[PDB]
Coordinates of C-alpha atoms and ligand atoms in Angstrom, one line a residue:
Chain A
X12 CA 65.9 -6.7 -12.7
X13 CA 63.8 -4.9 -15.3
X14 CA 60.5 -4.4 -13.6
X15 CA 59.7 -3.0 -10.1
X16 CA 56.0 -3.5 -9.2
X17 CA 53.3 -4.2 -6.8
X18 CA 52.0 -7.7 -7.6
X19 CA 48.9 -7.3 -9.8
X20 CA 46.5 -9.1 -7.5
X21 CA 43.7 -7.3 -5.6
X22 CA 45.1 -7.5 -2.0
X23 CA 45.2 -4.0 -0.3
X24 CA 48.7 -2.6 0.0
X25 CA 48.3 1.1 0.5
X26 CA 47.0 3.4 3.1
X27 CA 45.3 6.6 2.0
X28 CA 43.0 7.4 4.9
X29 CA 43.1 4.4 7.1
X30 CA 45.3 1.4 7.1
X31 CA 45.3 -0.8 4.0
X32 CA 42.3 0.9 2.5
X33 CA 43.5 0.5 -1.1
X34 CA 45.3 -1.5 -3.7
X35 CA 47.7 0.6 -5.8
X36 CA 48.8 -1.5 -8.9
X37 CA 51.9 0.1 -10.2
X38 CA 54.4 -1.4 -12.7
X39 CA 57.6 0.3 -13.6
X40 CA 59.5 -1.2 -16.5
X41 CA 63.0 0.1 -17.3
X42 CA 63.4 0.7 -21.0
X43 CA 66.9 2.2 -20.7
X44 CA 66.8 5.9 -20.1
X45 CA 63.0 5.9 -19.7
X46 CA 60.8 4.1 -17.2
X47 CA 57.5 2.8 -18.8
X48 CA 54.9 3.0 -16.0
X49 CA 51.4 1.5 -15.8
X50 CA 49.1 2.4 -12.9
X51 CA 45.6 1.7 -11.5
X52 CA 43.9 2.0 -8.1
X53 CA 41.2 0.1 -6.3
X54 CA 40.0 1.6 -3.0
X55 CA 38.5 -1.2 -0.9
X56 CA 37.3 0.5 2.3
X57 CA 37.2 3.7 4.2
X58 CA 36.6 7.3 3.4
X59 CA 37.4 7.0 -0.3
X60 CA 35.8 3.6 -1.1
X61 CA 32.4 4.9 -2.2
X62 CA 32.3 8.4 -3.4
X63 CA 29.1 10.3 -2.6
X64 CA 29.5 14.0 -3.2
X65 CA 25.9 14.7 -2.3
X66 CA 26.7 13.4 1.2
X67 CA 30.3 14.7 1.3
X68 CA 30.7 17.6 -1.2
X69 CA 34.3 18.3 0.0
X70 CA 35.7 14.8 -0.8
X71 CA 37.2 15.5 -4.2
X72 CA 40.8 14.4 -4.0
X73 CA 43.4 12.4 -2.2
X74 CA 47.1 11.7 -2.6
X75 CA 49.3 8.6 -2.6
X76 CA 53.1 9.3 -2.2
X77 CA 56.0 7.0 -2.9
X78 CA 59.1 8.4 -1.2
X79 CA 62.5 6.9 -1.9
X80 CA 66.0 7.3 -0.3
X81 CA 69.3 7.7 -2.2
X82 CA 69.3 4.0 -3.1
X83 CA 65.8 4.1 -4.6
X84 CA 64.4 2.2 -1.6
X85 CA 60.9 3.0 -0.5
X86 CA 60.6 5.0 2.8
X87 CA 58.0 4.0 5.4
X88 CA 56.2 7.4 5.4
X89 CA 55.1 6.4 1.9
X90 CA 51.4 5.5 1.5
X91 CA 52.3 2.3 -0.3
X92 CA 53.5 -0.4 2.1
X93 CA 57.1 -1.5 1.9
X94 CA 56.3 -5.2 2.0
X95 CA 54.4 -4.8 -1.3
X96 CA 57.0 -3.2 -3.5
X97 CA 59.9 -5.1 -5.1
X98 CA 61.3 -6.4 -8.4
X99 CA 59.0 -8.9 -10.3
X100 CA 59.4 -12.7 -10.0
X101 CA 56.8 -14.5 -12.2
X102 CA 53.5 -13.0 -11.1
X103 CA 54.9 -12.2 -7.6
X104 CA 57.9 -10.4 -6.1
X105 CA 61.4 -11.6 -5.0
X106 CA 61.5 -13.0 -1.5
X107 CA 63.7 -10.3 0.0
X108 CA 63.7 -6.5 -0.1
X109 CA 65.8 -4.9 -2.9
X110 CA 68.7 -2.7 -1.9
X111 CA 69.1 -0.7 -5.0
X112 CA 66.9 0.7 -7.7
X113 CA 68.4 4.0 -8.7
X114 CA 67.9 3.2 -12.3
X115 CA 64.1 3.4 -11.7
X116 CA 64.1 6.8 -9.9
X117 CA 62.9 9.9 -11.6
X118 CA 65.9 11.8 -12.9
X119 CA 66.9 14.7 -10.6
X120 CA 68.2 16.9 -13.4
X121 CA 65.0 16.4 -15.4
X122 CA 62.8 16.7 -12.2
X123 CA 64.7 18.7 -9.4
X124 CA 63.8 18.8 -5.7
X125 CA 62.0 22.1 -4.6
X126 CA 64.5 25.0 -4.1
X127 CA 64.7 28.7 -4.7
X128 CA 65.2 28.1 -8.5
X129 CA 62.2 28.3 -10.9
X130 CA 60.0 25.2 -10.7
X131 CA 59.1 23.7 -14.1
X132 CA 56.0 21.7 -15.0
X133 CA 57.8 19.0 -16.8
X134 CA 58.0 17.0 -13.6
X135 CA 54.2 16.4 -13.9
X136 CA 52.3 14.0 -16.1
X137 CA 48.5 14.3 -16.3
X138 CA 46.2 11.4 -17.3
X139 CA 42.5 10.5 -16.9
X140 CA 41.2 7.2 -15.7
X141 CA 37.6 6.0 -15.3
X142 CA 35.8 4.9 -12.2
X143 CA 34.3 1.5 -12.7
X144 CA 35.4 1.5 -16.3
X145 CA 32.4 3.7 -17.2
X146 CA 33.0 6.3 -19.9
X147 CA 31.1 9.0 -18.0
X148 CA 33.0 8.6 -14.8
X149 CA 36.5 10.3 -15.4
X150 CA 38.9 11.2 -12.6
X151 CA 42.2 12.8 -13.0
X152 CA 45.4 11.1 -12.0
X153 CA 48.3 13.7 -11.7
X154 CA 51.7 12.2 -11.2
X155 CA 54.6 14.5 -9.9
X156 CA 58.2 13.5 -9.6
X157 CA 60.7 14.5 -6.8
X158 CA 58.6 17.2 -5.2
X159 CA 58.2 15.7 -1.7
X160 CA 60.5 16.4 1.2
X161 CA 62.1 13.8 3.5
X162 CA 63.5 11.9 0.6
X163 CA 66.0 11.8 -2.2
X164 CA 63.3 10.9 -4.9
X165 CA 59.5 10.7 -5.0
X166 CA 56.6 9.8 -7.2
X167 CA 53.3 11.4 -6.1
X168 CA 49.8 10.4 -7.5
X169 CA 47.2 13.1 -6.8
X170 CA 43.7 11.7 -7.7
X171 CA 40.9 14.2 -8.1
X172 CA 37.6 14.6 -9.8
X173 CA 35.3 17.4 -10.7
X174 CA 32.0 15.6 -11.3
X175 CA 29.5 15.1 -8.6
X176 CA 29.5 11.3 -8.2
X177 CA 26.8 9.6 -6.2
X178 CA 27.7 6.2 -4.8
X179 CA 30.5 5.5 -7.2
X180 CA 33.1 3.0 -6.1
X181 CA 36.6 4.3 -6.5
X182 CA 38.3 1.6 -8.6
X183 CA 39.9 2.7 -11.9
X184 CA 40.9 1.8 -15.4
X185 CA 44.6 1.8 -16.1
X186 CA 46.9 4.5 -17.3
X187 CA 50.4 4.4 -18.9
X188 CA 53.0 7.1 -18.8
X189 CA 56.8 7.2 -18.9
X190 CA 59.5 9.3 -17.2
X191 CA 63.2 9.9 -17.6
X192 CA 65.3 7.7 -15.4
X193 CA 68.0 8.9 -13.0
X194 CA 70.5 6.3 -14.4
Chain B
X11 CA 62.5 -10.7 -25.9
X12 CA 62.3 -7.2 -27.4
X13 CA 60.4 -8.6 -30.4
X14 CA 57.5 -7.1 -32.3
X15 CA 54.2 -8.8 -33.1
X16 CA 52.4 -6.8 -35.8
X17 CA 49.8 -6.5 -38.6
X18 CA 52.6 -5.2 -40.9
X19 CA 52.1 -1.5 -41.6
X20 CA 50.8 -1.2 -45.2
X21 CA 47.1 -0.5 -45.9
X22 CA 45.8 -3.7 -47.4
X23 CA 42.5 -4.7 -45.7
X24 CA 43.2 -7.4 -43.0
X25 CA 40.1 -7.2 -40.9
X26 CA 36.3 -7.9 -41.0
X27 CA 34.0 -5.7 -38.9
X28 CA 30.7 -5.8 -40.8
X29 CA 31.7 -7.5 -44.0
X30 CA 34.7 -9.4 -45.4
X31 CA 37.9 -7.4 -45.4
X32 CA 36.2 -4.1 -44.8
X33 CA 39.0 -2.6 -42.8
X34 CA 42.7 -2.4 -42.0
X35 CA 43.7 -2.6 -38.3
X36 CA 47.3 -1.6 -37.8
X37 CA 48.4 -3.0 -34.5
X38 CA 52.0 -3.2 -33.3
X39 CA 52.9 -4.9 -30.1
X40 CA 56.4 -4.7 -28.7
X41 CA 57.7 -6.5 -25.7
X42 CA 59.4 -4.3 -23.1
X43 CA 59.9 -7.0 -20.5
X44 CA 56.9 -7.2 -18.1
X45 CA 54.9 -4.7 -20.3
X46 CA 53.8 -4.7 -23.8
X47 CA 54.0 -1.4 -25.5
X48 CA 51.1 -1.2 -28.0
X49 CA 50.4 1.1 -30.9
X50 CA 47.1 1.0 -32.8
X51 CA 45.1 2.7 -35.6
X52 CA 42.3 1.7 -37.8
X53 CA 41.2 2.3 -41.5
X54 CA 37.7 1.1 -42.4
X55 CA 37.6 0.9 -46.3
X56 CA 34.1 -0.5 -47.1
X57 CA 30.8 -1.5 -45.6
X58 CA 28.6 -0.3 -42.8
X59 CA 31.3 1.5 -40.8
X60 CA 33.2 3.1 -43.7
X61 CA 31.3 6.3 -43.9
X62 CA 29.5 7.5 -40.8
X63 CA 26.4 9.6 -41.0
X64 CA 24.7 10.0 -37.7
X65 CA 22.0 12.4 -39.1
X66 CA 20.6 9.6 -41.2
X67 CA 21.7 6.8 -38.9
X68 CA 22.0 8.2 -35.3
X69 CA 22.0 4.6 -34.0
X70 CA 25.4 3.8 -35.7
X71 CA 27.7 4.9 -32.9
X72 CA 30.0 2.0 -32.0
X73 CA 31.6 -1.2 -33.3
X74 CA 34.0 -3.9 -32.0
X75 CA 37.1 -5.6 -33.2
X76 CA 38.2 -8.7 -31.3
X77 CA 41.5 -10.5 -31.3
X78 CA 41.2 -14.0 -29.8
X79 CA 44.2 -16.0 -28.8
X80 CA 44.6 -19.6 -27.8
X81 CA 46.8 -20.7 -24.9
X82 CA 49.9 -20.3 -27.0
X83 CA 49.2 -16.7 -28.0
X84 CA 48.1 -17.8 -31.5
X85 CA 45.4 -15.7 -33.1
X86 CA 42.2 -17.7 -33.7
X87 CA 40.4 -17.8 -37.1
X88 CA 37.2 -16.3 -35.7
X89 CA 38.9 -13.1 -34.6
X90 CA 37.9 -10.0 -36.7
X91 CA 41.6 -9.7 -37.6
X92 CA 42.7 -12.1 -40.3
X93 CA 45.5 -14.6 -39.5
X94 CA 47.4 -14.2 -42.8
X95 CA 49.3 -11.1 -41.8
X96 CA 49.4 -11.1 -38.0
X97 CA 53.0 -12.2 -37.3
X98 CA 56.3 -11.4 -35.9
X99 CA 58.1 -8.6 -37.7
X100 CA 60.8 -9.2 -40.3
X101 CA 61.7 -5.9 -41.8
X102 CA 58.4 -4.4 -43.2
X103 CA 56.6 -7.7 -43.3
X104 CA 56.5 -10.8 -41.3
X105 CA 58.7 -13.9 -40.5
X106 CA 58.2 -16.8 -42.9
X107 CA 55.2 -18.6 -41.4
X108 CA 53.3 -18.3 -38.2
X109 CA 54.6 -17.9 -34.7
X110 CA 53.6 -20.9 -32.6
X111 CA 54.3 -19.1 -29.4
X112 CA 53.7 -15.5 -28.3
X113 CA 52.5 -16.0 -24.7
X114 CA 54.9 -13.2 -23.7
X115 CA 52.7 -10.7 -25.6
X116 CA 49.5 -11.8 -24.0
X117 CA 47.6 -9.7 -21.4
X118 CA 48.4 -10.9 -17.9
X119 CA 45.6 -13.1 -16.5
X120 CA 46.1 -12.1 -12.8
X121 CA 46.0 -8.4 -13.7
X122 CA 43.2 -9.0 -16.2
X123 CA 41.1 -12.1 -15.3
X124 CA 38.7 -13.8 -17.7
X125 CA 35.0 -13.3 -16.9
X126 CA 33.8 -15.1 -13.8
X127 CA 31.4 -14.3 -11.0
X128 CA 34.2 -12.6 -8.9
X129 CA 34.1 -8.8 -9.0
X130 CA 35.0 -7.4 -12.4
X131 CA 37.6 -4.6 -11.8
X132 CA 38.1 -1.8 -14.3
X133 CA 41.8 -2.1 -14.5
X134 CA 41.5 -4.5 -17.5
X135 CA 40.4 -1.5 -19.5
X136 CA 42.4 1.3 -21.1
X137 CA 40.6 4.2 -22.6
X138 CA 42.1 6.5 -25.2
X139 CA 40.8 9.0 -27.7
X140 CA 41.7 9.0 -31.4
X141 CA 40.7 11.3 -34.2
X142 CA 39.0 10.5 -37.5
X143 CA 40.8 11.8 -40.6
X144 CA 43.4 13.3 -38.3
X145 CA 41.0 16.2 -37.6
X146 CA 41.1 17.6 -34.0
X147 CA 37.3 18.2 -33.9
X148 CA 36.6 14.5 -34.7
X149 CA 37.3 12.5 -31.6
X150 CA 36.2 8.9 -31.2
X151 CA 36.9 6.7 -28.1
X152 CA 39.0 3.6 -28.4
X153 CA 38.3 1.4 -25.4
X154 CA 40.7 -1.5 -25.1
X155 CA 39.7 -4.4 -22.8
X156 CA 41.9 -7.3 -21.9
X157 CA 40.8 -10.9 -21.5
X158 CA 37.1 -10.3 -21.4
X159 CA 36.0 -12.4 -24.5
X160 CA 35.1 -16.1 -24.2
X161 CA 36.1 -19.0 -26.4
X162 CA 39.8 -18.2 -26.0
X163 CA 42.6 -18.1 -23.4
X164 CA 43.5 -14.4 -24.0
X165 CA 41.9 -11.6 -25.9
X166 CA 42.3 -8.0 -26.8
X167 CA 39.1 -6.2 -27.7
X168 CA 38.9 -2.8 -29.3
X169 CA 35.6 -1.0 -28.8
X170 CA 35.3 2.1 -30.9
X171 CA 32.6 4.6 -30.2
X172 CA 31.8 8.2 -30.6
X173 CA 29.3 10.7 -29.2
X174 CA 29.6 13.4 -31.8
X175 CA 27.0 13.4 -34.6
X176 CA 29.3 12.8 -37.6
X177 CA 28.1 13.5 -41.2
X178 CA 29.7 11.4 -44.0
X179 CA 32.9 11.0 -42.1
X180 CA 35.3 8.3 -43.2
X181 CA 36.4 6.1 -40.3
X182 CA 40.2 6.1 -40.5
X183 CA 42.0 7.1 -37.4
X184 CA 45.1 8.6 -35.8
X185 CA 47.3 6.3 -33.7
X186 CA 47.1 5.6 -30.0
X187 CA 49.8 4.1 -27.7
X188 CA 49.1 2.2 -24.5
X189 CA 50.7 -0.7 -22.6
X190 CA 49.5 -3.6 -20.6
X191 CA 51.0 -6.0 -18.1
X192 CA 52.4 -9.1 -19.9
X193 CA 51.5 -12.6 -19.0
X194 CA 55.1 -13.7 -19.0
Chain C
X12 CA 72.9 3.9 -28.1
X13 CA 69.3 3.0 -27.3
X14 CA 68.4 6.7 -26.5
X15 CA 68.5 9.8 -28.6
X16 CA 67.8 12.9 -26.6
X17 CA 68.1 16.6 -26.0
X18 CA 69.7 15.9 -22.5
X19 CA 67.4 16.8 -19.5
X20 CA 68.8 20.2 -18.5
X21 CA 66.9 23.4 -19.1
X22 CA 69.5 25.1 -21.4
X23 CA 67.5 26.5 -24.5
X24 CA 68.1 24.3 -27.6
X25 CA 65.2 25.2 -29.8
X26 CA 64.1 28.1 -32.0
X27 CA 60.4 28.5 -32.4
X28 CA 60.2 32.2 -33.2
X29 CA 63.6 33.5 -32.2
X30 CA 67.0 32.0 -31.5
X31 CA 67.0 29.5 -28.7
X32 CA 63.7 30.8 -27.3
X33 CA 62.9 27.4 -25.8
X34 CA 64.1 24.1 -24.4
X35 CA 62.5 21.1 -26.1
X36 CA 63.1 18.1 -23.9
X37 CA 62.7 15.0 -26.1
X38 CA 63.8 11.6 -25.3
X39 CA 63.5 8.8 -27.9
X40 CA 64.1 5.4 -26.5
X41 CA 64.3 2.6 -28.9
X42 CA 62.1 -0.4 -27.9
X43 CA 62.8 -2.4 -30.9
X44 CA 60.3 -1.9 -33.7
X45 CA 58.7 1.0 -31.7
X46 CA 60.2 4.2 -30.4
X47 CA 59.0 5.3 -26.9
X48 CA 59.0 9.1 -26.9
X49 CA 58.8 11.5 -23.9
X50 CA 58.4 15.2 -24.7
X51 CA 57.9 18.5 -22.9
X52 CA 58.5 22.1 -23.8
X53 CA 59.7 25.2 -21.8
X54 CA 59.6 28.5 -23.7
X55 CA 61.8 31.0 -22.0
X56 CA 61.6 34.0 -24.3
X57 CA 60.0 35.5 -27.4
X58 CA 56.6 35.4 -28.9
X59 CA 55.4 32.2 -27.3
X60 CA 56.9 32.7 -23.9
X61 CA 53.9 34.4 -22.2
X62 CA 50.6 33.7 -23.8
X63 CA 47.9 36.4 -23.6
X64 CA 45.0 35.9 -26.0
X65 CA 43.1 39.0 -24.8
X66 CA 46.1 40.9 -26.2
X67 CA 46.8 38.5 -29.1
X68 CA 43.8 36.4 -29.8
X69 CA 45.6 35.3 -33.0
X70 CA 48.4 33.4 -31.3
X71 CA 46.9 30.0 -30.9
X72 CA 49.6 27.6 -32.2
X73 CA 53.2 27.0 -33.3
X74 CA 55.2 24.2 -34.7
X75 CA 58.5 22.6 -34.0
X76 CA 60.0 20.5 -36.7
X77 CA 62.7 17.8 -36.6
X78 CA 63.9 17.0 -40.2
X79 CA 66.3 14.0 -40.8
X80 CA 68.2 12.8 -43.8
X81 CA 68.6 9.3 -45.0
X82 CA 70.9 8.4 -42.2
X83 CA 68.6 9.7 -39.4
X84 CA 70.8 12.8 -39.0
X85 CA 69.1 16.0 -37.9
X86 CA 69.1 18.6 -40.6
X87 CA 70.2 22.1 -39.7
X88 CA 66.9 23.6 -40.9
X89 CA 65.1 21.8 -38.0
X90 CA 63.8 24.0 -35.2
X91 CA 65.8 21.9 -32.7
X92 CA 69.6 22.6 -32.7
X93 CA 72.0 19.9 -33.7
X94 CA 74.4 20.8 -30.9
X95 CA 72.8 18.8 -28.2
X96 CA 70.7 16.2 -30.0
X97 CA 72.7 13.0 -29.6
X98 CA 72.8 9.6 -28.1
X99 CA 72.9 9.7 -24.3
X100 CA 75.9 9.4 -22.0
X101 CA 74.8 9.9 -18.3
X102 CA 72.9 13.2 -18.0
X103 CA 74.7 14.5 -21.1
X104 CA 75.5 13.3 -24.6
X105 CA 78.3 11.3 -26.3
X106 CA 81.2 13.6 -27.2
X107 CA 80.9 13.0 -31.0
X108 CA 77.9 13.7 -33.2
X109 CA 76.3 10.6 -34.4
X110 CA 76.2 9.6 -38.0
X111 CA 73.4 7.1 -38.2
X112 CA 70.1 6.7 -36.4
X113 CA 67.8 5.1 -39.0
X114 CA 66.4 2.8 -36.3
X115 CA 64.9 5.9 -34.5
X116 CA 63.2 7.1 -37.7
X117 CA 59.5 6.9 -38.2
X118 CA 58.6 4.0 -40.6
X119 CA 57.9 5.1 -44.1
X120 CA 55.4 2.4 -45.0
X121 CA 53.4 3.2 -41.8
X122 CA 53.9 6.9 -42.3
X123 CA 54.6 7.7 -46.0
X124 CA 55.8 11.0 -47.4
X125 CA 53.1 13.0 -49.2
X126 CA 52.2 11.7 -52.7
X127 CA 49.1 11.4 -54.9
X128 CA 48.2 8.1 -53.1
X129 CA 45.4 8.4 -50.4
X130 CA 46.7 10.1 -47.2
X131 CA 45.8 8.3 -44.0
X132 CA 45.6 9.7 -40.4
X133 CA 47.8 7.1 -38.8
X134 CA 50.8 9.2 -39.2
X135 CA 49.4 11.5 -36.4
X136 CA 49.3 11.2 -32.6
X137 CA 47.3 13.7 -30.5
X138 CA 48.0 14.4 -26.8
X139 CA 47.1 17.1 -24.3
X140 CA 49.6 18.7 -22.0
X141 CA 49.1 21.4 -19.3
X142 CA 50.7 24.8 -19.0
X143 CA 52.4 25.5 -15.8
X144 CA 51.1 22.2 -14.6
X145 CA 47.7 23.7 -13.9
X146 CA 44.8 21.3 -14.7
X147 CA 42.6 24.1 -16.2
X148 CA 45.3 25.1 -18.7
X149 CA 45.3 22.3 -21.4
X150 CA 47.1 22.7 -24.8
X151 CA 47.1 20.1 -27.6
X152 CA 50.4 18.6 -28.7
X153 CA 49.9 17.0 -32.2
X154 CA 52.8 14.9 -33.5
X155 CA 53.0 14.0 -37.2
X156 CA 55.5 11.7 -38.9
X157 CA 57.1 12.1 -42.3
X158 CA 54.9 14.8 -43.7
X159 CA 57.6 17.4 -44.1
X160 CA 59.4 17.8 -47.4
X161 CA 63.2 18.2 -48.0
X162 CA 64.0 15.2 -45.8
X163 CA 63.9 11.5 -45.9
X164 CA 62.1 11.5 -42.4
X165 CA 60.5 14.0 -40.1
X166 CA 58.8 14.4 -36.7
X167 CA 56.7 17.5 -36.3
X168 CA 55.1 18.9 -33.1
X169 CA 52.2 21.2 -33.6
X170 CA 51.2 22.9 -30.3
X171 CA 47.8 24.7 -30.1
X172 CA 45.2 25.7 -27.6
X173 CA 41.7 26.9 -27.8
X174 CA 41.1 28.5 -24.4
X175 CA 41.8 32.3 -24.0
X176 CA 44.7 32.3 -21.7
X177 CA 45.8 35.6 -20.0
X178 CA 49.6 35.8 -19.1
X179 CA 50.2 32.1 -19.0
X180 CA 53.8 31.1 -19.5
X181 CA 54.2 28.3 -22.0
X182 CA 56.0 25.6 -20.1
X183 CA 54.4 22.2 -20.2
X184 CA 53.8 19.1 -18.3
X185 CA 55.3 16.0 -20.1
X186 CA 53.7 13.6 -22.6
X187 CA 54.5 10.1 -23.7
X188 CA 53.7 8.4 -27.0
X189 CA 55.3 5.9 -29.4
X190 CA 55.7 5.3 -33.1
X191 CA 56.7 2.5 -35.5
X192 CA 60.4 2.6 -36.5
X193 CA 61.9 2.4 -40.0
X194 CA 64.1 -0.5 -39.0
Ligands
LIG1 C1 35.9 7.6 -22.5 C2 35.8 9.1 -22.6 O1 36.5 9.7 -23.4 N1 35.0 9.6 -21.7 C3 34.6 11.0 -21.8 C4 33.0 11.1 -21.8 C5 32.4 10.4 -23.0 O2 32.9 11.0 -24.2 C6 30.9 10.5 -23.0 O3 30.4 10.3 -21.7 C7 30.3 9.5 -24.0 O4 29.0 9.7 -24.2 O5 32.6 12.5 -21.8 C8 33.0 13.3 -20.6 O6 32.8 14.6 -20.8 C9 31.5 15.1 -20.8 C10 31.5 16.4 -21.5 O7 32.1 16.2 -22.8 C11 32.2 17.5 -23.5 O8 32.8 17.2 -24.7 C12 30.9 18.1 -23.7 O9 31.0 19.4 -24.3 C13 30.1 18.3 -22.3 O10 28.8 18.8 -22.6 C14 30.1 17.0 -21.6 O11 29.3 16.1 -22.3 C15 32.2 12.8 -19.4 O12 32.4 13.3 -18.3 O13 31.2 12.0 -19.6 C16 34.5 13.1 -20.3 C17 35.0 11.7 -20.4 O14 36.5 11.8 -20.4
LIG2 C1 43.0 17.1 -30.4 C2 42.0 17.6 -29.3 O1 42.3 17.6 -28.1 N1 40.7 17.8 -29.8 C3 39.7 18.3 -28.9 C4 39.0 19.5 -29.6 C5 40.1 20.6 -29.9 O2 40.7 21.0 -28.7 C6 39.3 21.8 -30.5 O3 38.4 21.3 -31.5 C7 40.3 22.8 -31.1 O4 39.6 24.0 -31.2 O5 38.0 20.0 -28.8 C8 36.8 19.1 -28.8 O6 35.9 19.7 -27.9 C9 35.4 21.0 -28.3 C10 35.7 22.0 -27.1 O7 37.1 22.2 -26.9 C11 35.0 23.4 -27.5 O8 35.1 24.3 -26.5 O9 33.6 23.1 -27.8 C12 33.4 22.3 -28.9 C13 32.0 22.3 -29.3 O10 31.6 23.6 -29.8 C14 34.0 20.9 -28.6 O11 33.3 20.3 -27.5 C15 36.2 19.0 -30.2 O12 36.5 19.8 -31.1 O13 35.4 18.1 -30.4 C16 37.3 17.8 -28.2 C17 38.6 17.2 -28.9 O14 39.1 16.2 -28.0
LIG3 C1 44.1 17.5 -16.0 C2 42.7 17.5 -16.7 O1 42.2 16.5 -17.1 N1 42.3 18.8 -17.0 C3 40.9 19.0 -17.5 C4 40.2 20.0 -16.6 C5 40.0 19.6 -15.2 O2 39.3 18.3 -15.1 C6 39.2 20.6 -14.4 O3 39.7 21.9 -14.6 C7 39.4 20.3 -12.9 O4 40.7 20.8 -12.5 O5 38.9 20.2 -17.2 C8 38.8 20.8 -18.5 O6 37.5 20.8 -18.9 C9 36.6 21.7 -18.1 C10 35.5 20.9 -17.5 O7 35.9 20.0 -16.5 C11 34.5 21.9 -16.9 O8 33.4 21.2 -16.4 O9 34.0 22.9 -17.8 C12 35.1 23.7 -18.3 C13 34.5 24.7 -19.2 O10 33.8 25.7 -18.4 C14 36.1 22.8 -19.1 O11 35.5 22.2 -20.2 C15 39.4 22.2 -18.4 O12 39.6 22.8 -17.3 O13 39.7 22.8 -19.5 C16 39.6 19.9 -19.5 C17 41.0 19.6 -18.9 O14 41.6 18.6 -19.8
ZN4 ZN1 32.1 -1.7 -1.1
ZN5 ZN1 37.4 5.2 -47.4
ZN6 ZN1 59.6 32.2 -18.3

């Protein structure tokens, strides 16, 4: 079981603002002590489908959280739907929900849960993706590990942009990053 | 399969952008299961794109290098990259002849569909920035697109471009790493 | 044996300007002919701990060097301490110091040592990381392979920034890159 993923089709699997308003494509491949991750996002409807900052100046960011319990299982408060996340089988997923994926969780010593101790920035990775694949439409994808509550582990994607986009569909290029694995 | 498909890493020209063997593309593809970890750099040694001067030629701002593969993952002759040294790695060179299969290194067609009249999504593109001559003030964009060429089953296209006005700058780049979802 | 690392704790292991003034977290995971690297830096004391370019406009960069001999063993003149640079075991290291790691070394034909032959830029990788995890606090991390002398192989991290930061602690987000291995 070396890859946990959302199948790479275009069917909605994530709820940002309203039910199933987006397709998060996330592939986590275990390369031993590091997880190699590849991510992209297609928003298909709702509030974040077409960005028009002339009309809505305040719509400049949104968040997608993946919350996991002690066994690396996705919790239902996550934005990504549970039915859509599992180990890879061909171009699809296994038939039944996995029970353990601790080896794909962000390492708690590298990336500790919030506490009264000093918080370090190494639990964040920043990247830039491009809306519609156009070079002049960058948006930031900030990924943070284990900073959510109500979970043993978490991966949070905070998307934001600073440009004033007018009628730009929120569907992105892909970004790769890695993180240190719990086991 | 943790093998590596590569161009070998010396600097002998192995690619044709504007004229025969005018450049050396160094591309290393390593299979990490469902993802291919890729490392790429480029050295142009002659011809039109060797030395850039956007004051005399402001129109020269981009070029393309295409790798075309057949259904077996074999590089096709009409790719910009020459077939002679694109092969699986054996030490600092290649295995004795020519792989026949490398489908496991090809860009996934569900993730990155060939052109059609269905909506074209941006996820088949990865943008990166590399630097000419290793200088921090000489960025150029390397845009990599998967499976968008025709006359092939799979493809990897590198579109190089720059918006800075370069003056007699040699086009040889730093390296960029990206990954993509593997077909198998 | 597929991972050479600094361990993921925050105990200082690197000397930039003064003894153990920082924790360099570096994980090298061998993915065959390519090494997948993940790096971040936390400076805890000394000259590069708090950056203030109003006060010291001259402090705009520093370097961290890892020098290796023919066997891939870290030389003591590296900025990183030999103490906790070893193959991984859980969240720590193996008890005994390794004696060979040539397969983690940057390839000499791809990245040759300086000579009177033409020097090419492919032995460099540039990335951007963010101080304190703030998006408006970018710094460049430039990594160069095999350009140091007095070693068979080397990996050098050159950090620099161009913005005038005022009392910004140098602790970074993480960055991932890869390089061609010697064997
Ligand atoms: C693919 C990529 O790197 N996109 C860049 C983009 C392109 O370089 C540009 O659109 C190509 O012509 O530039 C972006 O920044 C614009 C910004 O760039 C600074 O260097 C410049 O000083 C500013 O005046 C301004 O041009 C863009 O938003 O278009 C960023 C994007 O990441
Ligand atoms: C390696 C890297 O990130 N290079 C940057 C480059 C360097 O940060 C900078 O040259 C180091 O001083 O900065 C580039 O953009 C520049 C801006 O940072 C600067 O404020 O204004 C410059 C124009 O006067 C320029 O836009 C650069 O030098 O081209 C971009 C490059 O990616
Ligand atoms: C995480 C990231 O990409 N950070 C960018 C940063 C952010 O996009 C921005 O601060 C929003 O948080 O933007 C940087 O570039 C700036 C431009 O976005 C801005 O328009 O002009 C600034 C100069 O006045 C600056 O060039 C930044 O804040 O430095 C670049 C950084 O990588
Ligand atoms: Zn629409
Ligand atoms: Zn030249
Ligand atoms: Zn501090």
